[PDB]
Amino acid sequence: DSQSNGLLNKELFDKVWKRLSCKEKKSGQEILLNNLVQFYSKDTVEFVEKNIFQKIIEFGWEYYLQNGMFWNCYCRLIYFDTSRSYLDKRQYIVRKIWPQIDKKFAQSVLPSLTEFCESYFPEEMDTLEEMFTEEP
Amino acid sequence: ALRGLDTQFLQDNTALVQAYRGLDWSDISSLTQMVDVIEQTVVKYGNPNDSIKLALETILWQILRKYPLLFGFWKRFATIEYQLFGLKKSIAVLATSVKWFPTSLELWCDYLNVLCVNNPNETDFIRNNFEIAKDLIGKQFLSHPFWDKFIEFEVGQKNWHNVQRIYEYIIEVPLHQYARFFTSYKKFLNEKNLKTTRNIDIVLRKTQTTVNEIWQFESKIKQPFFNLGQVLNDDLENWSRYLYHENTWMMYIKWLTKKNISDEVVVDIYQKANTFLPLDFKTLRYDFLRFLKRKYRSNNTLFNNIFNETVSRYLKIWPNDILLMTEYLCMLKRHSFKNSLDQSPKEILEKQTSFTKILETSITNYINNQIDAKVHLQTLINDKNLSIVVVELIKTTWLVLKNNMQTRKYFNLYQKNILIKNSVPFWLTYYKFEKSNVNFTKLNKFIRELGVEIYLPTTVMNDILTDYKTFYLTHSNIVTYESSIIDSNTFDPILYPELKMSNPKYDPVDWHKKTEWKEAGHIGITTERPQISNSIIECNSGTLIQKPISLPNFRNLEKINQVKINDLYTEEFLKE
Amino acid sequence: VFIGGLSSLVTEDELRAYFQPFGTIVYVKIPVGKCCGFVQYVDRLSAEAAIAGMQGFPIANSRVRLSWGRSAKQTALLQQAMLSNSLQVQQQQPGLQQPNYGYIPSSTCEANVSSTMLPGCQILNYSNPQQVIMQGSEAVVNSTNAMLNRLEQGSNGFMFA
């Protein structure tokens, strides 16, 4: 659909990934994340979700799991994708992103994820509040 | 505003009824009308308030005399002077008497009995009780007054051990251990009270307020919280607040939230701080809104109605504020149209289309100036807050129902309205929409128009130009850029955002009479400066020798002393 | 600056959003319904840039009138001494007690420091409301990160400014 491959050229994405790998020592990680989620397509978003976000989960790095901007961006990638309908993007977010965030991190992740769920999913706000209620 | 003149007018109108010696039904109702206008305007301190209750009682208006007492209790929490009078009256009453007399007594006992100066209130109820022949009821008030740290506690103890000749020490051990434990607390409390009793002196200073010791007293009753505390810190806040200070309210609410009483008590305190506090504080109010959102999960139906009446009352007083409108609309989408993932999808999609339908009929109703007060959203729309409703309609039409044709039709319709052509979330939603589709034609036409015909705040224009340059550099190639360059506007999306940042009014492409020349060295102060008409200082001296130089022509030689000032400040604001 | 001719439908935060990128800003109080405001900057240079750049720009569809104008204290002083019409004399605004070496005027920073204090950089700055901060290294990261925050929250409606 006539899309120039932006940051995800294999010569530039290595320069991105060697800086995302340093994880707190280098400043400005959030802007690299936030500039890698504007693709809004099928296979482009599928590349981004298969290569950065899934791999940060797979390594289990604590800086990005701790940080609420990471999960806000990983929701905002899928939700602005114009290849899915409403039901499958909402069900994908609530069923397979939000379970993965660890409950010990919820005090930092919930203030950033709450603004997302309050802006775009006011109906599914009670599910997110009951996933992180103070009593299990 | 003039609380002194409102004090003076009631002091003058009462002195007109009193010295003309008549009932004076004009001035009787005028002093009552001056009382009603004052009490609605001012919280009416109990010492001033008592005279109004005394005069109406002197005018024998029993049903109205009871109702002003309830208002007095709301106005002053430490109003034991109004509490005792309301207990002194309503004993001269009808058949409901015996039940009402204890009802006002027990309501004051939950209001004032934990105060150090509360010894008169229990004694008066004891006086009411001793006038009855319910010596069992007199005995119950005796044991309760023994257990609370009061002024004349030892005086009460010895007196109750002689008047009760029939049943004095049926349980010696229980009564004296409660009395001595009361004496342990009152010995403790004597440190703070005497530190308060030696500072309160009206000299129009911080000692009359006793705020340092009141913050000391409230602090030391917070930590040693032996469960009288929540009543005690209420009693501690009551004497400290009466001496408007919203920070004291925030500390009392923070302590009471940490103490975990039932939430309706907290809602009562929140409503009282909403009522008696002055407007524009804007910090405990949004605290109340987010408490109503957080506690919504426990009990469903009544908190929606508390929330709804709160947001309506806060668009009464801050109509220019917009976070209330989107907050109301978030709660409306959650409560009224709720549908989980587990439900079948036609139900979900019909609830979304119902929400789009009510929202569109709301804004279409308000633009064409026909109102429908049955639906609460129709009432809540204000023209400062209309734009966020249009934004919710756009974002719901585009991101949920997912039709781009209908979304573009709404953009092309509503960007021509007066109220929302200069709104920030409408245009910034438009930017996110025409960024989602990756086309640059609408984005170049948008940011080429961003200063001249779409007026946004300069912080938002700077944010849009920075993010659009960052977006264009990473999503567009040279073959698109070199065909995007047109010369009549000298527009180029790489460099034009770098020049248009801080100055909004930027046109891209007889000098001596512009308003940049005339006030050159000094802004605002305009002076036509003298200059030579045909100056030769640009001409080199290698070319001045070729032909002889003419005489100078002058312009503006009359005005080396005239300097003139457009003083907007004095004219439009000092002299109105 | 005296900003005159306001719509009266404009708040103080929305008025801070216009006049902030010209330079750092001590206060932005506006009277209740006189249809005119008051903005005060730290720098004379930034205030002159604001009068140049924002002259006649429409805030909520009314062409605005920018000029000079005193504070709130001096305005109360002139109002009572004009109702008594005695003198109405003003007082000069306080100086920066120069030579001052850290500060490069008309500059904004929004939020451990081992800076090499060299000339091209900036060393000291006024904090945004107020106090004085040693300028850190990472100004652009905090600034760009806050504007991405401001875009994503302003599109949904949590700040009209």
UniProtKB/Swiss-Prot annotation, chain A:
Keywords for the protein's UniProt record, in alphabetical order: mRNA processing, mRNA splicing, Nucleus, Repeat, Ribonucleoprotein, RNA-binding, Spliceosome
BP GO annotations: mRNA 5'-splice site recognition; mRNA splicing, via spliceosome
GO molecular function: RNA binding
A GO CC term assigned to this protein in UniProt: U1 snRNP
HAT repeat spans: 48-80
Major place of residence: nucleus
Subcellular location, record wording: Nucleus
Subunit structure as annotated in this protein's UniProt entry: Component of the 18S U1 snRNP particle, a subcomplex of the spliceosome.
Other known facts: Present with 1730 molecules/cell in log phase SD medium.
Free-text function comment from the UniProt entry: Essential component of the U1 snRNP particle, which recognizes and binds the 5'-splice site of pre-mRNA. Together with other non-snRNP factors, U1 snRNP forms the spliceosomal commitment complex, that targets pre-mRNA to the splicing pathway. U1 snRNP is cotranscriptionally recruited to intron-containing genes. Required for U1 snRNP biogenesis.
Protein name as it appears in the record: U1 small nuclear ribonucleoprotein component PRP42
Section of the entire sequence shown: 409 to 544 of 544
From Swiss-Prot, chain B:
Task of the protein: Function prior to stable branch point recognition by the U1 snRNP particle to facilitate or stabilize the U1 snRNP/5'-splice site interaction. Has a direct role in the assembly or function of a catalytically active spliceosome.
A GO CC term assigned to this protein in UniProt: nucleus
Gene3D superfamilies in alphabetical order: Tetratricopeptide repeat domain
Places the protein is found: Nucleus
Pfam family, one: HAT_PRP39_N
SMART domains recorded: HAT
Upper lineage: Eukaryota, Fungi, Dikarya, Ascomycota, Saccharomycotina
One of the GO biological process terms: mRNA 5'-splice site recognition
The keyword Phosphoprotein is annotated on this UniProt entry: no
Further remarks about this protein from its record: Present with 4460 molecules/cell in log phase SD medium.
Alphabetic keyword roster: mRNA processing, mRNA splicing, Nucleus, Repeat
Protein name: Pre-mRNA-processing factor 39
InterPro entries the record matches: HAT, TPR-like_helical_dom_sf
Family: Belongs to the PRP39 family.
Principal location listed in the UniProt entry: nucleus
HAT repeat residue numbers: 51-83, 85-117, 121-156, 158-191, 216-243, 402-436
Curated annotation (Swiss-Prot), chain C:
Domain of life the protein comes from: Eukaryota
Free-text disruption phenotype from the record: Affects the meiotic recombination and the formation of viable spores.
Name listed for the protein in its UniProt record: Protein NAM8
UniProt free text on domains: The RNA binding domains RRM2 and RRM3 are required for NAM8 meiotic function. Within the U1 snRNP complex, the RRM2 domain of NAM8 is positioned to bind to the intronic region immediately down-stream of nucleotide +13.
Residues covered by the RRM domain: 1-71
More info: Present with 1480 molecules/cell in log phase SD medium.
Annotated gene: NAM8
Subunit structure, as described in the record: Component of the U1 small nuclear ribonucleoprotein complex (U1 snRNP).
Purpose: Component of the U1 small nuclear ribonucleoprotein complex (U1 snRNP) involved in the initiation of meiotic recombination. Involved in the formation of DSBs at recombination hot-spots through meiosis-specific splicing of REC107 pre-mRNA. Collaborates with MER1 to promote splicing of essential meiotic mRNAs REC10, AMA1, MER3, HFM1, SPO22 and PCH2. NAM8 interacts with the pre-mRNA downstream of the 5' splice site, in a region of non-conserved sequence and is required for efficient splicing of uncapped RNA precursor.
